[PDB]
Symmetry: C3
Subunit: 289 residues, 3 copies
């Protein structure tokens, strides 16, 4: 069976003083198409493969291609995947929970470098033999994640730096906890990063959380992000503040809202301020198809 899913988003993206002779506000948009092929068996093993075609404003040649494949095999709550896989640090819960606005951006997200599902092709040739293996397992409210990524699998392994990651998250109805650790993140020798987060749903209406990170070799250093959101019917108000160890940095912060216009249609905006006093704002829509 083959199925297609995706989304489109378009809105205004404002960056204070982006550059000499550059408009500070443009229309930024993205079109995402996923192509999923799956084969189900009567033995309960589901085989799958996916491809992604993703277009973003400003993309080279004003064109769209697919990325590199991802294959998986699933059985009894376990999934093993190969090729362009989702990684542990990028898949755990809570780590992207302060993101806001129609581009789901946050300075309160982790300031480190690490591998992740590659949504598009890469013109530098750096991903040509990139190959990952990941394993996930969901023990009810408890998710476990494991990923190994070799940036160039054709070359003797002793000559390249492979990334190894693990994560686990857990949740009941009102508390969630999440943790992840990754060594040689992004193929960088000694770039070892970690994440621990916790969140509390202090209603059915509100949640507050805290994420801490060790950003490994990044200039940012350790980081803490405090975030919260509140739902008022169809609108959701979100806010966060984040600090890094880097000498002299400002405290990052942001405020935003999400309006659930209909199932599949969300209007979102945000005003944020970064660690180097960058001012960014957005307003747009996303629709899921």
């Amino acid at each position: 069976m083959i199925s297609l899913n995706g989304y489109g988003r378009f809105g205004l993206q404002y960056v204070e003083d982006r550059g000499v002779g550059l408009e500070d506000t443009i229309i930024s948009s993205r079109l995402r198409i996923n192509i999923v092929g799956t084969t189900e068996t009567d033995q309960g093993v589901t085989f799958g493969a996916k491809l992604r075609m993703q277009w973003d404003d400003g993309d080279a040649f004003a064109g769209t291609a697919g990325n590199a494949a991802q294959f998986w095999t699933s059985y009894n709550g376990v999934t093993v995947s190969v090729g362009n896989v989702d990684t542990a640090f990028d898949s755990v819960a809570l780590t992207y929970a302060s993101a806001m606005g129609y581009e789901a951006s946050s300075f309160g997200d982790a300031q480190s470098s690490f591998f992740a599902y590659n949504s598009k092709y890469d013109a530098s040739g750096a991903l040509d033999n990139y190959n990952g293996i990941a394993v996930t397992y969901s023990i009810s409210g408890v998710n476990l994640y494991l990923s190994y990524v070799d940036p160039d699998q054709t070359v003797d392994s002793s000559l390249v730096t492979e990334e190894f990651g693990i994560a686990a998250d857990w949740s009941n109805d009102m508390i969630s906890l999440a943790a992840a650790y990754t060594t040689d993140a992004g193929g960088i020798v000694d770039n070892d990063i970690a994440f621990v987060g916790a969140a509390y749903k202090f209603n059915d209406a509100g949640t507050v959380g805290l994420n801490w990170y060790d950003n490994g070799l990044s200039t940012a250093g350790d980081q803490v992000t405090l975030y919260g959101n509140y739902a008022f019917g169809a609108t959701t108000v979100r806010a966060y503040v984040s600090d890094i160890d880097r000498a002299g940095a400002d405290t990052a912060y942001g405020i935003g809202a999400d309006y659930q216009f209909a199932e599949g249609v969300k209007v979102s905006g945000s005003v944020q301020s970064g660690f180097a006093n960058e001012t960014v704002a957005d307003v747009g829509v996303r629709f899921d198809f």
Copy 2:
């Protein structure tokens, strides 16, 4: 929801004395696939996005990719679109009504340069930040069209030439009228073009029309095209003659036929002569899927 539609066409394309060591007749064909994603809401606002994958014989690398996206939002007869939009001068009725043959070509089409929906990627990089906004509105038999296209939206607007177009067409059962005007057409300062056309269905079987254009800065100058067609059951006979102001040009003309073989399947041929006495002929099929 995601849907796919398209067509394929293949036939012979003959160009008199195309060039030294070049075959005058080749097999020219095109494969077009549209990918449409739409999200409907109970509030009557439909959100949509589309992508196109188009292959033509002779295409670089013998490959196919998608073009840049187009997004739209529709409500009560109004449609607002963003990104790679259809423009006013290219979308009005009647302006392509003399086209014929399986490649739907005509020297009697407007001889100017202007922006239009870009069916493919562009290897020069000229379209990378091309961004348009269009608005259409259909007041029963009366269509209205508006388009604004900024060729590079990242750069201060004062430094680039934006294209602005408007058009309207109207039709009852037997007369149609259409008009369009576009300033700085194709991003060219002072390339201001206009179109006025009219057509008369003098039966349920025949139509005759006239299109006049101001081709702006083009070498062609003003132009007039007279065309007509007649349906004989499943066959349609078409003809046109066109003149331009350019000193010394020949009167362009063509004669063709369309055979409706089945719903979705059309066999078409044509013999045409251009403004510089070029001789072109074609014969082929198009099938819609």
Copy 3:
């Protein structure tokens, strides 16, 4: 109507002493998506077109695009195709019958150069104006095939070398016979190749066959391949031995097995040895969607 079909395959691919500083075993995988558009008519003529998007591990830019189109028209057992067609030597039965392993490889396949359906784009530009025409006709158990391929159809034909091929195969329930001949195979003046094969199903469980080839201008020279397979319930055991005329070559051979895990899911492995004593082995899965 538009339909999508394809498959995904992933496993281990081992090449003895592949190269200094190169891992002998990697994970090799392929994702194939076919896009088929067809238009049926009440007159019994079916029009079709297809496109292919194929990703293989190691592919340039870690991306995927479509290849060049293929169009066809079918009526009463006859199919005429244009553009990127299947050729006679590549489509006849039996010629790939000794292939084994999850990559369906065999040194016992023909050692010549010839044109074939191009599954992907080609970055050299060599396929840009490549255009073929093929005709197949199936007279019950008897298939006939014809293909003409012009590598650059825009240039006077006298200046290029066109490939012409024919083949026929025939089968009752227990014997199959197949033959093919192609002149100027692969666009190479005087590269004339031929194939004759025969196979005998000596049960409902076993088959043995022999293929002979004239590999035209190749260094290999004439070739003979002897192969056989036996089905044991859900497993199939295959073997082959092949010899070429090239002075000094080793006898090529291989042994493999296929496990039909479920409809659409096949686990396959193989150990093979080539003409220059290369050692290759594989083990993997293929799933059809």
